[PDB]
Design a protein around this ligand. Structure first.
Ligand code: WG3
Length: 134
């Protein structure tokens, strides 16, 4: 047992707050914001050795990242940004930093009760997205 076992599984979006404004701050255009905001993703998290895989599946896009904690990777985001990402575990929270064009955004994933809470921060704007087990 490890590290992320409390994250592993299949998770479904149950609430979102301030996601349109988060997306505006990251630079997402109108049409992508409207369709992305309407998405109801499932989040599938798995671990195999040192490799963590996170899949986000929705009607708008299916995206998947695999990574090793602390080891930077190049990522293409849902909104088609090319970013440099690093994911670490800090005090039981998965912290995902994306860097591009001299900007930065941080996505934190934490277990809280029976939920997986995703907090997304860009400049002063926070979005909170709550998932429960599927
Ligand atoms: O995993 C989550 O809750 C989180 C996100 C998400 O769900 N995104 C999406 C899920 C389906 C479809 C589209 C998106 C989409 N995100 C974005 C830009 C904001 C990045 N453009 O489209 C993004 C942050 C964490």
């Amino acid at each position: 047992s490890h590290m992320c076992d409390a994250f592993v599984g299949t998770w479904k979006l149950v609430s979102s707050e301030n996601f349109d404004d988060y997306m505006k701050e990251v630079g997402v255009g109108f049409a992508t914001r409207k369709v992305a905001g309407m998405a109801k993703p499932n989040m599938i998290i798995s671990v195999n050795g040192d490799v963590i895989t996170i899949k986000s599946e929705s009607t708008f896009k299916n995206t998947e990242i695999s990574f090793i904690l602390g080891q930077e990777f190049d990522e293409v985001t849902a909104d088609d940004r090319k970013v440099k990402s690093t994911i670490t575990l800090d005090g039981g929270v998965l912290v995902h930093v994306q860097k591009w064009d001299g900007k930065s955004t941080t996505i934190k994933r934490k277990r809280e009760d029976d939920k997986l809470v995703v907090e997304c921060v860009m400049k002063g704007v926070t979005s909170t997205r709550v998932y429960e087990r599927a």
